[PDB]
Amino acid sequence: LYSDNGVFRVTSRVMFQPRLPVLSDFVQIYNCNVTFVNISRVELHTVIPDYVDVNKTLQEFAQNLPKYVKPNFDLTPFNLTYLNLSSELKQLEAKTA
Amino acid sequence: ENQKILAASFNKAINNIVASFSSVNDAITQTAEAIHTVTIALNKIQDVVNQQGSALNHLTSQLRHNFQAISNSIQAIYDRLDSIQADQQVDRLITGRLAALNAFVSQVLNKYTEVRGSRRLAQQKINECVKSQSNRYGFCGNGTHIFSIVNSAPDGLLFLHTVLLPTDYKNVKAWSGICVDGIYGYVLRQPNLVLYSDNGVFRVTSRVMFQPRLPVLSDFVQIYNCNVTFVNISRVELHTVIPDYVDVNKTLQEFAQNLPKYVKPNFDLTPFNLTYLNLSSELKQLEAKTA
Ligand SMILES: *[C@@H]1O[C@H](CO)[C@@H](O[C@@H]2O[C@H](CO)[C@@H](O[C@@H]3O[C@H](CO[C@H]4O[C@H](CO)[C@@H](O)[C@H](O[C@@H]5O[C@H](CO)[C@@H](O[C@@H]6O[C@H](CO)[C@H](O[C@@H]7O[C@H](CO)[C@@H](O[C@@H]8O[C@H](CO)[C@H](O)[C@H](O)[C@H]8O)[C@H](O)[C@H]7NC(C)=O)[C@H](O)[C@H]6O)[C@H](O)[C@H]5NC(C)=O)[C@@H]4O)[C@@H](O)[C@H](O[C@H]4O[C@H](CO)[C@@H](O)[C@H](O[C@@H]5O[C@H](CO)[C@@H](O[C@@H]6O[C@H](CO[C@@H]7O[C@@H](C)[C@@H](O)[C@@H](O)[C@@H]7O)[C@H](O)[C@H](O)[C@H]6O)[C@H](O)[C@H]5NC(C)=O)[C@@H]4O)[C@@H]3O)[C@H](O)[C@H]2NC(C)=O)[C@H](O)[C@H]1NC(C)=O
Ligand SMILES: *[C@@H]1O[C@H](CO)[C@@H](O[C@@H]2O[C@H](CO)[C@@H](O[C@@H]3O[C@H](CO[C@H]4O[C@H](CO)[C@@H](O)[C@H](O[C@@H]5O[C@H](CO)[C@@H](O[C@@H]6O[C@H](CO)[C@H](O[C@@H]7O[C@H](CO)[C@@H](O[C@@H]8O[C@H](CO)[C@H](O)[C@H](O)[C@H]8O)[C@H](O)[C@H]7NC(C)=O)[C@H](O)[C@H]6O)[C@H](O)[C@H]5NC(C)=O)[C@@H]4O)[C@@H](O)[C@H](O[C@H]4O[C@H](CO)[C@@H](O)[C@H](O[C@@H]5O[C@H](CO)[C@@H](O[C@@H]6O[C@H](CO[C@@H]7O[C@@H](C)[C@@H](O)[C@@H](O)[C@@H]7O)[C@H](O)[C@H](O)[C@H]6O)[C@H](O)[C@H]5NC(C)=O)[C@@H]4O)[C@@H]3O)[C@H](O)[C@H]2NC(C)=O)[C@H](O)[C@H]1NC(C)=O
Ligand SMILES: *[C@@H]1O[C@H](CO)[C@@H](O[C@@H]2O[C@H](CO)[C@@H](O[C@@H]3O[C@H](CO[C@H]4O[C@H](CO[C@H]5O[C@H](CO)[C@@H](O)[C@H](O)[C@@H]5O)[C@@H](O)[C@H](O[C@H]5O[C@H](CO)[C@@H](O)[C@H](O)[C@@H]5O)[C@@H]4O)[C@@H](O)[C@H](O[C@H]4O[C@H](CO)[C@@H](O)[C@H](O)[C@@H]4O)[C@@H]3O)[C@H](O)[C@H]2NC(C)=O)[C@H](O)[C@H]1NC(C)=O
Ligand SMILES: *[C@@H]1O[C@H](CO)[C@@H](O[C@@H]2O[C@H](CO)[C@@H](O[C@@H]3O[C@H](CO[C@H]4O[C@H](CO[C@H]5O[C@H](CO)[C@@H](O)[C@H](O)[C@@H]5O)[C@@H](O)[C@H](O[C@H]5O[C@H](CO)[C@@H](O)[C@H](O)[C@@H]5O)[C@@H]4O)[C@@H](O)[C@H](O[C@H]4O[C@H](CO)[C@@H](O)[C@H](O)[C@@H]4O)[C@@H]3O)[C@H](O)[C@H]2NC(C)=O)[C@H](O)[C@H]1NC(C)=O
Ligand SMILES: *[C@@H]1O[C@H](CO)[C@@H](O[C@@H]2O[C@H](CO)[C@@H](O[C@@H]3O[C@H](CO[C@H]4O[C@H](CO[C@H]5O[C@H](CO)[C@@H](O)[C@H](O)[C@@H]5O)[C@@H](O[C@H]5O[C@H](CO)[C@@H](O)[C@H](O)[C@@H]5O)[C@H](O)[C@@H]4O)[C@@H](O[C@H]4O[C@H](CO)[C@@H](O)[C@H](O)[C@@H]4O)[C@H](O)[C@@H]3O)[C@H](O)[C@H]2NC(C)=O)[C@H](O)[C@H]1NC(C)=O
Ligand SMILES: *[C@@H]1O[C@H](CO)[C@@H](O[C@@H]2O[C@H](CO)[C@@H](O[C@@H]3O[C@H](CO[C@H]4O[C@H](CO[C@H]5O[C@H](CO)[C@@H](O)[C@H](O)[C@@H]5O)[C@@H](O[C@H]5O[C@H](CO)[C@@H](O)[C@H](O)[C@@H]5O)[C@H](O)[C@@H]4O)[C@@H](O[C@H]4O[C@H](CO)[C@@H](O)[C@H](O)[C@@H]4O)[C@H](O)[C@@H]3O)[C@H](O)[C@H]2NC(C)=O)[C@H](O)[C@H]1NC(C)=O
């Protein structure tokens, strides 16, 4: 595994045949010897393409019970809930009068 | 299912060899070519004994040749001449017989040298075919090795290799890779797998035996720029050749406006419905109260 001027590639040790790394070439070697590459999980896709965090994406923007159908992010056809109760109080005052 | 036929084909092979050792030769020469090896194995064992016998038969036969003396028996030489004249005759036989012994010793010493060179091969075969199942071609058995059995013989060992031989073949429509969208291409990583497709379904097998199974995403690398003799397929239908593969981000775009399709949410249930209708509900309440 090697990196030139910001891009990572994987080649053999006998010939020089570069290509792109894939997730199917890595195992988990926990406790991280010191002379490794320091990188956070939010930016792992910049060294290993075809890899995305399956649950973090739904934690970010998959928020409502369905994703939507329901008034959701800047939906124009829908209108304002919880914007008639002040008028309800005013009309309750009028009704009491 | 292979072990049901292998036992039946091995038990007959054992019986054929044990019958071939029983000197009944010409009756079973029509059966197969298993005789081709047993005849050589028997001839070698016969020769290794005949050669040993002949060496001593030649050594013991050189006492008959009287050298330039009166006779070949010393008791006769000492019976005719006196003591001062028999010493010039006895040494003529002594010198010949000593030279006869020397040539025999020089041959036995050469004979021992070949055996130590032959023992290295015997040890190497024991180390490689009896305990390890070596994979070098043309080594024990001409086919694919499985195991071996050892037995003793006159001052030697006799091996029993066990190999496999193909009988029937199958025709397979091969391919060379998958090229999606004309630029991204996938090929099999290990060079011992064949990607093939019969009447609309794709499977992956080996190149030595025929063991089909289903392809998985863990067997493909990215081989960008798509040699021409590939399989033309778009990314929207990649799951029909590689199961257990779905696009993670495109489904996010599609499954988003399309959740009401699968599966349909319940109507009139919070918080899917009944928004923007509460201003109308307040208006109706006011109208009813006023009336
Ligand atoms: C991808 O992605 C996805 C999505 O995202 C995912 O999924 C998911 O996710 C999520 C996220 O969010 C997650 O979650 C997470 O988690 C994490 C982890 O966790 C951890 O922890 C937890 C807790 O801690 C736990 O649970 C878990 O586990 C557990 O553990 C445990 C232990 O600890 C165990 O056991 C348990 O225990 C308990 C206790 O102990 C109990 O038991 C007990 O015991 C005892 C003894 O021991 C006993 O005895 C007793 O004792 C006592 C003393 O102590 C006395 O004495 C008595 O007498 C006696 O008796 C007892 O008995 C017992 N009990 C019983 C009942 O029995 C229990 O039971 C047990 O069970 C368990 O088992 C376990 N489990 C299992 C299952 O295993 C773990 O460990 C976490 O961490 C997180 O969180 C965090 O973060 C966040 C952010 O993010 C933050 O925020 C948090 O904080 C928070 O904050 C808030 C504010 O805002 C708060 O709230 C508050 O609250 C309060 C309350 O308080 C308390 O409580 C209650 C209950 C009551 O009590 C009251 O009174 C008091 O006060 C208030 O309310 C206020 O107002 C509010 O505001 C909170 O709190 C906080 N928190 C805390 C904790 O604190 C944090 O920081 C999160 O949550 C999940 O998980 C997931 N899922 C799953 C399934 O997993 C996924 O996963 C992903 N994936 C991947 C691969 O990645
Ligand atoms: C999965 O999945 C997921 C989900 O889907 C994803 O995620 C996401 O996704 C998404 C999707 O949607 C995506 O997106 C996409 O993307 C694609 C690609 O992209 C591309 O392109 C873009 C743009 O073009 C970009 O951005 C990127 O990158 C970039 O690049 C660049 C280059 O180009 C760079 O740089 C930059 O540049 C710029 C410019 O140039 C700037 O700079 C500058 O420079 C200059 C020079 O050079 C300078 O100087 C200047 O100059 C001038 C001249 O020129 C003058 O002279 C001056 O004086 C001077 O000074 C300056 O200075 C500068 N500036 C500054 C400020 O400084 C900047 O800055 C820079 O930066 C960069 O860097 C980059 N970036 C990075 C980060 O790297 C790439 O390239 C695309 O393509 C797409 O789109 C497409 O498609 C669609 C559909 O699909 C369509 O629709 C589109 O079209 C559109 O349409 C619309 C309509 O409907 C439109 O709208 C419109 O608009 C308009 C406006 O216009 C304009 O603008 C504004 C601003 C203003 O200006 C105004 O005024 C004007 O007019 C209006 O408004 C109207 O009304 C409307 O309607 C639009 O526009 C269109 N578009 C266009 C473009 O046009 C298309 O066709 C999409 O978007 C994303 O991306 C994602 N994410 C991520 C993260 O990636 C994921 O991814 C997935 N995954 C997988 C694995 O697959
Ligand atoms: C990925 O990231 C992680 C975490 O960020 C990182 O993990 C640690 O990385 C460090 C550094 O690579 C490892 O080594 C540590 O180094 C510490 C030294 O830093 C201090 O000393 C500097 C000068 O010391 C040198 O020179 C003197 C002679 O003058 C010599 O005796 C020393 O041995 C040494 O050679 C000094 O310049 C430095 O100051 C920094 O900050 C100032 C600003 O404040 C800046 O101006 C300077 O330019 C400089 O950047 C600093 O003061 C050392 O202290 C540390 O020791 C710890 O551990 C030992 C036990 O081993 C404890 O006994 C000790 O008390 C300390 O707690 C340690 O040796 C370190 O081993 C890594 N691991 C851990 C767990 O910390 C990875 O390396 C990164 N991976 C990459 C980059 O690939
Ligand atoms: C996956 O899909 C991609 C893209 O769809 C595909 O990539 C290209 O595929 C083509 C075809 O396999 C590759 O070869 C090209 O073929 C073109 C020939 O088509 C024209 O000529 C036909 C007759 O020519 C033959 O016969 C004459 C003698 O008569 C002989 O001299 C020729 O050499 C040739 O053998 C003709 O029948 C055909 O007409 C079609 O369309 C009509 C309808 O209009 C229909 O009725 C016919 O039945 C027929 O289907 C057509 O007119 C050829 O022109 C082309 O050349 C281009 O490239 C060269 C440079 O190499 C340029 O110099 C030239 O100007 C052209 O631009 C090319 O040779 C082609 O190489 C592939 N790649 C690219 C980048 O195009 C993959 O093959 C697909 N993979 C699969 C299927 O596995
Ligand atoms: C369906 O749901 C909708 C939302 O979910 C809901 O829409 C909202 O309706 C409310 C009323 O019921 C609106 O509140 C009013 O706001 C008036 C302010 O209007 C001034 O700004 C307009 C532009 O607004 C844009 O900018 C502001 C920031 O300033 C921003 O917050 C907005 O989101 C907008 O981006 C001016 O409109 C002009 O410009 C737009 C383009 O931007 C043109 O399209 C117009 O044609 C027009 O040219 C407007 O002229 C005003 O300048 C409040 O009016 C104030 O100002 C007048 C003077 O003009 C005073 O006399 C008033 O006393 C008051 O101070 C008004 O009182 C009220 O608060 C709310 O803005 C709407 N939201 C959106 C996003 O549109 C629908 O009502 C709902 N449908 C139903 C049937 O209920
Ligand atoms: C709770 O939330 C739900 C969302 O999860 C919501 O369901 C959907 O709401 C949308 C808006 O609120 C609806 O969109 C509207 O569609 C109108 C067009 O309707 C025409 O087709 C109807 C039949 O629909 C079926 O066929 C279409 C394909 O053609 C298919 O997409 C649908 O899913 C349906 O299968 C016609 O209804 C007729 O037939 C049904 C039986 O099928 C009868 O019960 C009816 O009484 C009626 O006879 C209807 O008449 C239309 O022909 C949009 O209308 C536009 O187009 C017409 C021309 O067709 C114009 O005249 C209009 O002016 C306008 O331009 C309308 O604007 C809106 O977009 C969507 O249909 C809902 N889906 C379902 C499955 O119901 C619930 O409504 C919501 N409930 C509450 C109480 O809030």
Chain A CA closest to residue B245: A50
- Amino acid B256 reads A
User: If phi over 0 gives left and psi between -120 and 50 gives alpha, with beta otherwise, what is residue B238?
Assistant: alpha
Helix (H, G, I), strand (E, B) or coil at A10: strand
Chain B nearest C-alpha distance from A9 (Å):
12
**Cα B111 off chain centre by:** 36
What separation in angstroms does the CA of B3 have from each of A41, B7, B8, B9, B210? 50, 6, 9, 10, 16
Torsion angle in degrees (nearest 10) through CA of B108, B113, B118, B119 = 100
User: What is d(CA B225, CA B98) in angstroms, rounded to the nearest whole number?
Assistant: 85
Residues of A in contact with B290 (CB under 8 A): none
Q: Which residues of B263-278 are buried (b: 16+ CB within 10 A; e: fewer)?
A: eeeeeeeeebeebeeb
B259 touches chain A (CB under 8 A): yes
Q: Phi and psi for B110 in degrees, rounded to 5?
A: -65, -35
B190 touches chain A (CB under 8 A): no
| Cβ-based neighbours of B26, under 8 Å, separated by 6 or more | none
Experimental method: cryo-EM
What separation in angstroms does the CA of B195 have from each of B60, B98, B152? 73, 78, 48
- Amino acid B166 reads P
User: What is d(CA B230, CA B258) in angstroms, rounded to the nearest whole number?
Assistant: 34
Q: Are B140 and B129 contacting, i.e. CB atoms less than 8 angstroms apart?
A: yes
Q: Are B178 and B185 contacting, i.e. CB atoms less than 8 angstroms apart?
A: yes
B253 lines ligand 2 (CB under 6 A): yes
Q: Which residues of A3-14 are buried (b: 16+ CB within 10 A; e: fewer)?
A: eeeeeeeeeeee
What is the dihedral sign for C-alpha B14, B16, B19, B20? negative
Residue B195 has a CB neighbour count (10 Å cut-off) of 21
What is the dihedral sign for C-alpha A60, A62, A64, A69? positive
Please judge whether A20 and B224 are an interchain contact, meaning their C-beta atoms are less than 8 angstroms apart.
yes
A12 touches chain B (CB under 8 A): no
Q: Are B159 and B147 contacting, i.e. CB atoms less than 8 angstroms apart?
A: no
Residue B89 has a CB neighbour count (10 Å cut-off) of 19
Q: Looking at ligand 4, which residue's alpha carbon is closest to its atom 5?
A: B232
Looking at the DSSP bridge assignments, the partners of residue B160 are B149
Nearest alpha-carbon partner for B62 in B96, B19, B32, B21: B96
* DSSP assignment letter at B238: G
Residue from B197, B228, B229, B231 to probe ligand 4 pocket by mutation (most atoms less than 8 Å from CB): B228
Residues of B in contact with A75 (CB under 8 A): none
B251 lines ligand 2 (CB under 6 A): no
User: What is d(CA B14, CA B8) in angstroms, rounded to the nearest whole number?
Assistant: 10
B282 touches chain A (CB under 8 A): yes
Kindly provide the resolution of this structure in angstroms, with one decimal.
3.4
User: What is d(CA B144, CA B163) in angstroms, rounded to the nearest whole number?
Assistant: 5
Q: Are strands B193-198 and B201-206 parallel, antiparallel or unpaired?
A: antiparallel
Residue B59 sits at the vertex; the CA angle it makes with B54 and B61, to the nearest 5 degrees, is: 95
Residue B6 has a CB neighbour count (10 Å cut-off) of 13
Nearest alpha-carbon partner for B211 in B192, B238, B187, B230: B192
Atom in ligand 6 nearest the alpha carbon of residue B274? 83
Structure tokens at B222: 């990215």
Q: Are strands B231-233 and B178-180 parallel, antiparallel or unpaired?
A: parallel
Which of A9, A25, A54, A69 is the mutation pick for testing B, counting most B CBs within 10 A?
A69
B267 touches chain A (CB under 8 A): no
Ligand index nearest the alpha carbon of residue B277: 6
Q: Which residues of A26-37 are buried (b: 16+ CB within 10 A; e: fewer)?
A: eeeeeeeeeeee
